[PDB]
């Protein structure tokens, strides 16, 4: 007769717990860039979790930092999908 008060929440984090999140001053953040591109291409075709998985792959494979500072050079990033959803989510019907 009840559902958890924390149910039906989805947290699409740009990066894994404890990690830095990369941004490109000209193109925007790696995550948002990728998220919008995947939503534009798949929002009318794939379930949300599957769209976000594509975002994970895009960020993970197509981006790598470049820095004169060795500490911040050649770094990578993986987004983090946190789902407390109870149903599949399609932006179309």
């Amino acid at each position: 007769h009840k559902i958890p008060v924390e149910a039906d929440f989805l947290y699409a984090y740009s990066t894994a717990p404890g990690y830095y999140s990369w941004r490109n001053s000209k193109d925007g953040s790696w995550f948002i860039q990728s998220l919008c591109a995947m939503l534009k291409q798949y929002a009318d075709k794939l379930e949300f979790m599957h769209i976000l998985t594509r975002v994970n792959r895009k960020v993970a494979t197509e981006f790598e930092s470049f820095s004169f500072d060795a500490t911040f050079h050649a770094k990578k990033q993986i987004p983090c999908i946190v789902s407390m959803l109870t149903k599949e989510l399609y932006f179309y019907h």
Partner: protein, 146 residues
Amino acid sequence: SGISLDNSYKMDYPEMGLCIIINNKNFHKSTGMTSRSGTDVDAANLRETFRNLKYEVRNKNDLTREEIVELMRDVSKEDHSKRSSFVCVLLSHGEEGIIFGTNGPVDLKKITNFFRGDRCRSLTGKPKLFIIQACRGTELDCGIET
């Protein structure tokens, strides 16, 4: 009617819902936080992307910790009965579990709590999406060659 399965959220309400975008680029000097160059590119990209998904987008720029909490509280107090879902995008500096207002931190839990199933009745049973573009610490992923 025929067999009815409920494996997908009902997304055919009159409205898809709100898409609140909080874009923090400039921070109070006293915080010692640097400007987030390029964040406007993200903000614009999201506005257009969600506009095409039929979301009622509302962009908010450079909000203090006080204004973020006030905005979220007010939004959670709206009647979302005719809306299918809710989306909130946060663009700012951050740490694990924290998003930064222009003058200080805001616990993500405080923001999301306003939308709990028992605190925002018109969204109970509906998908509540929070998209967070912010650091969750200082760790750097060195990656591995494939």
